[PDB]
Amino acid sequence: KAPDWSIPSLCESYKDDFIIGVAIPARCLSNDTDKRMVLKHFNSITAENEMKPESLLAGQTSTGLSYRFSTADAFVDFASTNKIGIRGHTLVWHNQTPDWFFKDSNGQRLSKDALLARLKQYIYDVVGRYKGKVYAWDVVNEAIDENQSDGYRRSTWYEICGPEYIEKAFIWAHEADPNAKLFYNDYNTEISKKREFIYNMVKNLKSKGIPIHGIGMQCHINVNWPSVSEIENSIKLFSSIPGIEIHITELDMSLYNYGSSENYSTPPQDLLQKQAQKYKEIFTMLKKYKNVVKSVTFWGLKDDYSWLRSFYGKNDWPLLFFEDYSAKPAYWAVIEA
């Protein structure tokens, strides 16, 4: 271990810009060093997996749902006690939701009305439990597929409900906790047709009075794509819809190009530099738009915790702190942005 407790706090450095957050697993809440790091640098956390439907759901009775809240309570209480925000992540997603959720006791797919009724109870029960304690929810995650002509992912949600599951999720979440800021969250927001679909969906929801307050740009990006100016275009277009704030929700930056045969066992110094410069430019840009960009969260505490390593099966260095907790070139560039 080599954490440096003397260096500038990220979140304090960004005091007058925006909240700076971190995604962590449950183990981090009760690890002495992880905990100290989180509280030194961050004034928002997101539960990496522990507030998703597969983690909250225990099962069904003939008429309702049963839940397991004790780990998620630990997350929301951590945030309450240390006076930092917690973004709830996430209420409606095609991933990380049990297959039995879309089915009755007998395993038969639920009808539209029955699935919607189950969504409403779910959102009432989860959002209701944490009323007042969660500054922002990712209500709907990754509902857009730019390869479809109507722009909608053909998930079970969509197959069963058509697109009205989206708007209804926001309605019910806003009923269960009217002071939470509710987000539509997605990745690849710089893909041209995807950005358009996301923009039209949210504009249309807003036009009709659906209570969406925000777009979450995941920003799982890499050192070579997309450009900072592409990311800025998303921010401009999305925040052009009145009443739509921006959270940068799952920021990270791979050292690889997508689909690359490259494979590193230590990070090339030149890529670590390119990473620093790009992170700096991004954050200089974000400061410019702090009137609409309110919260920026990194998807991991430090590089060895990154989801990328297990997902794509090769070592990677996507964040601001190394495996030993030491500040990377990116950290120094970001504090000076």
Side-chain angles (χ1 to χ4, degrees):
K1 300 196 179 158
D4 198 331
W5 309 117
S6 64
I7 68 171
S9 155
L10 281 163
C11 58
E12 290 307 312
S13 308
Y14 281 81
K15 260 176 61 134
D16 316 311
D17 300 296
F18 37 65
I19 291 171
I20 301 300
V22 65
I24 47 171
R27 74 182 190 259
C28 290
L29 299 176
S30 83
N31 167 289
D32 294 343
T33 312
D34 286 346
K35 169 179 175 155
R36 196 187 168 179
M37 198 69 36
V38 165
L39 294 167
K40 170 169 173 59
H41 290 279
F42 298 102
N43 55 6
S44 178
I45 46 165
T46 304
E48 188 179 1
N49 295 283
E50 297 78 357
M51 295 174 75
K52 295 160 178 179
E54 73 178 12
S55 313
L56 296 189
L57 290 168
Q60 77 200 287
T61 58
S62 72
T63 66
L65 295 174
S66 66
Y67 300 99
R68 51 215 180 158
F69 284 125
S70 78
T71 298
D73 290 352
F75 273 93
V76 172
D77 289 350
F78 184 98
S80 288
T81 302
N82 303 289
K83 306 186 158 53
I84 59 165
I86 177 165
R87 301 195 69 267
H89 177 80
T90 175
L91 293 171
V92 175
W93 192 27
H94 66 287
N95 288 328
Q96 292 186 260
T97 296
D99 293 342
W100 62 256
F101 193 78
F102 305 94
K103 302 166 177 179
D104 201 359
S105 282
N106 64 351
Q108 205 176 26
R109 282 159 77 104
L110 287 173
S111 71
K112 174 166 170 192
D113 189 68
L115 181 56
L116 290 174
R118 176 169 281 179
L119 176 55
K120 170 176 186 178
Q121 156 198 201
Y122 183 74
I123 288 176
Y124 279 17
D125 290 339
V126 173
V127 176
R129 182 181 189 81
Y130 300 124
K131 190 167 177 191
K133 299 187 183 198
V134 170
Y135 82 111
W137 280 98
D138 288 331
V139 176
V140 177
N141 202 32
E142 306 180 3
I144 293 299
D145 181 352
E146 66 274 15
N147 306 313
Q148 303 292 322
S149 298
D150 69 9
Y152 289 114
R153 188 182 293 278
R154 300 303 199 260
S155 57
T156 305
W157 276 114
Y158 179 89
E159 294 181 338
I160 294 175
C161 299
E164 83 185 73
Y165 77 99
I166 302 162
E167 66 201 59
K168 291 185 159 295
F170 282 93
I171 290 166
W172 298 323
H174 184 57
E175 287 166 352
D177 183 355
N179 302 304
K181 291 182 171 189
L182 305 181
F183 292 80
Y184 171 73
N185 194 51
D186 219 335
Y187 64 102
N188 279 354
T189 46
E190 293 63 65
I191 295 296
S192 294
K193 193 75 183 136
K194 190 171 192 177
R195 189 203 274 133
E196 186 199 341
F197 280 128
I198 294 175
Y199 173 78
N200 289 316
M201 183 187 65
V202 169
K203 193 165 57 167
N204 299 0
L205 292 170
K206 251 303 197 209
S207 73
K208 301 190 315 218
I210 301 305
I212 175 168
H213 314 110
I215 288 168
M217 291 165 57
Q218 293 183 17
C219 297
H220 293 296
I221 57 168
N222 67 51
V223 296
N224 287 323
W225 194 88
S227 64
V228 182
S229 107
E230 285 169 302
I231 295 166
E232 182 179 9
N233 293 341
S234 302
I235 292 170
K236 290 169 59 184
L237 172 65
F238 294 153
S239 65
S240 88
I241 307 174
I244 295 300
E245 307 124 64
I246 300 302
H247 282 195
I248 300 308
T249 53
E250 315 195 358
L251 184 51
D252 55 28
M253 190 196 303
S254 183
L255 302 191
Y256 303 107
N257 299 325
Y258 193 84
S260 183
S261 294
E262 303 298 9
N263 189 316
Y264 315 117
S265 292
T266 63
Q269 278 191 270
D270 63 331
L271 293 189
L272 290 171
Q273 176 133 307
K274 289 182 60 160
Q275 171 176 81
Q277 185 49 38
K278 197 173 175 173
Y279 266 129
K280 184 173 168 164
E281 292 176 35
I282 280 162
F283 271 84
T284 300
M285 185 269 304
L286 298 174
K287 281 175 59 166
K288 204 156 155 263
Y289 287 91
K290 72 171 150 267
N291 72 306
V292 294
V293 179
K294 305 305 195 187
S295 182
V296 179
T297 296
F298 289 89
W299 207 254
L301 187 62
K302 57 197 263 271
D303 284 346
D304 60 329
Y305 290 14
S306 181
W307 73 288
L308 289 163
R309 293 189 177 196
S310 172
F311 194 82
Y312 297 112
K314 57 190 181 173
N315 210 345
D316 205 343
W317 291 275
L319 293 163
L320 306 187
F321 303 92
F322 281 129
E323 295 98 312
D324 75 351
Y325 303 93
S326 71
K328 296 171 66 179
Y331 162 91
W332 299 106
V334 155
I335 61 169
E336 298 149 45

